[PDB]
């Protein structure tokens, strides 16, 4: 969960700040090792979450939900075209998938640079969030590929059903 | 050592419980009124002078052993206390000199 990930990250960050105050040796090296470990853990979590979202379209795994869809009819001038646009339904599904993925992949970045100072804020992907983890998925690109394939399959099925239902514009147009 | 043919460096002052036995024997002989090897008595007096320093050296050896054991335990953080390890190594080198 997003709140649980945020709480764990905040605890890790408070511990890191305390360690920086502790005046140990090799603080940057330790920060790098901790960041790499956090990256591996987040990657395992992200692969699991992508798989779970794909299944939901079809415990550390997680289980997101789904919204509704734009399905309707009209005869406004006698054009039976489903509302909103089928592109609208595809955009809604893609946005939901992006939000579910970003719920995990958009957790706060490692605050190991709190001990660092001298330059401006470096909030890139891994600077602000854990940006690189989406490419750091341990399962590989197969999970994101499965998500995209599921989106494409749902869209294709929706288009097929919509076409089958909407073949009858000629009845009102003849 | 047992399992390690490398020389396990038990560096310390040239001391043992025999010095404490000599100091106690000198005290007992002084209390009870006996003759003794007065050169050995002077050596025992010097040992009694140096005894607190020997105790400090033994305590330092014990502390260094404890630090080594802590490093062996938390090898997962062994780089994190590298500064303390380097400071201890430098101090130990100065003492060995």
């Amino acid at each position: 969960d997003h709140k649980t990930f945020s709480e764990i990250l905040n605890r890790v960050q408070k511990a890191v700040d305390d360690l920086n105050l502790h005046s140990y040796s090799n603080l940057p090296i330790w920060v790098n090792k901790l960041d790499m470990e956090i990256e591996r853990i987040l990657g395992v979590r992200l692969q699991a979450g992508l798989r779970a979202w794909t299944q939901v379209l079809l415990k550390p795994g997680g289980e997101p939900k789904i919204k509704n869809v734009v399905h309707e009819l009209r005869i406004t001038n006698q054009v039976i075209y489903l509302n909103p646009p089928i592109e609208e339904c595809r955009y809604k599904l893609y946005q939901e998938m992006f939000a579910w993925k970003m719920v995990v992949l958009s957790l706060p970045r490692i605050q190991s640079q709190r001990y660092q100072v001298g330059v401006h804020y470096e909030l890139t992907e891994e600077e602000k969030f854990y940006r690189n983890a989406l490419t750091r998925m341990p399962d590989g690109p197969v999970a994101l590929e499965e998500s995209y394939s599921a989106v494409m399959g749902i869209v294709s099925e929706v288009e097929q059903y919509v076409k089958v239902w909407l073949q009858y514009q000629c009845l009102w147009d003849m | 050592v047992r399992g390690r043919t490398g020389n396990v460096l038990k560096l310390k002052v040239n001391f043992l419980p025999e010095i404490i036995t000599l100091s106690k024997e000198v005290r007992n002989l002084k209390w009870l009124g006996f003759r003794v090897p007065l050169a050995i008595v002077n050596k025992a007096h010097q040992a009694n002078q140096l005894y607190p320093f020997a105790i400090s050296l033994i305590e330092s050896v014990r502390t260094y052993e404890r630090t080594c054991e802590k490093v062996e335990e938390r090898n997962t953080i062994s780089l994190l206390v590298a500064g303390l390890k380097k400071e201890v190594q430098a101090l130990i080198a100065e003492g060995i000199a």
């Binding site: 090799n26 | 490398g6 460096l9 590298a82 390890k85």
Partner: peptide
């Protein structure tokens, strides 16, 4: 911005400290 390169804080190994000590003991 000179990324990292913070001298790679490290120290001599305990076996390395013992080996340098053995060399000093030969030199002692």
């Amino acid at each position: 911005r000179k990324l990292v390169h913070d001298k790679e804080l490290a120290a001599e190994d305990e076996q390395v400290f013992l080996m340098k000590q053995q060399s000093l003991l030969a030199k002692q």
